[PDB]
Amino acid sequence: TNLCPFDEVFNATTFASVYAWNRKRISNCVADYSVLYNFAPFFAFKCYGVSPTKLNDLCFTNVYADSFVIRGNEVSQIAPGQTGNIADYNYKLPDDFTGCVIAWNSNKLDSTVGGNYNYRYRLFRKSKLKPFERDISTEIYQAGNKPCNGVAGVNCYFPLQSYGFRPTYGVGHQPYRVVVLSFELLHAPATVCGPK
């Protein structure tokens, strides 16, 4: 059984920051999507252009699994047709997205008493991200005459901020692990099918 490696995406010890989101290419394997219930506990699940109950009947050219952490009240921006600070500057689904967005609360893994400042997000950007564009620049934006020289300050804007997840937060501000499963259908031989 040449099963797709969903485990290393969904069961990864640490997830990426949303601005530096991870992408796993999934090709030439059997995708048993029923195993996702064991890798992620009690997860939210929205599909677009596919029905969630027929995933094991479908064949795709490739699958992509993008993963990152955002706070709970941002999960709604990981959807086609959405705008917001995450959709605009961090991770952008296209309006014609075909795939599923899976999110689950990761407070137990990703919050810390003092705050998890390792998860970060981008604050502003020269333009909105295009679909599946990734911007990991940390360069300080120089607005004034004086060069910044890697020192944020007056007229010198560091473009990221940390979430600082703490377990005292309400769920809307708790960390959620997100996996975006993209289902790519080209006019080409399929390489990812359900068990059937």
Binding site: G84, N85, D88, Y89, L123, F124, R125, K126, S127, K128, Y141, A143, Y157
Partner: peptide, 9 residues
């Protein structure tokens, strides 16, 4: 508050 495209702050 922030430069470039910002808006949300």
């Amino acid at each position: 508050y922030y430069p470039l495209l910002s808006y949300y702050y």
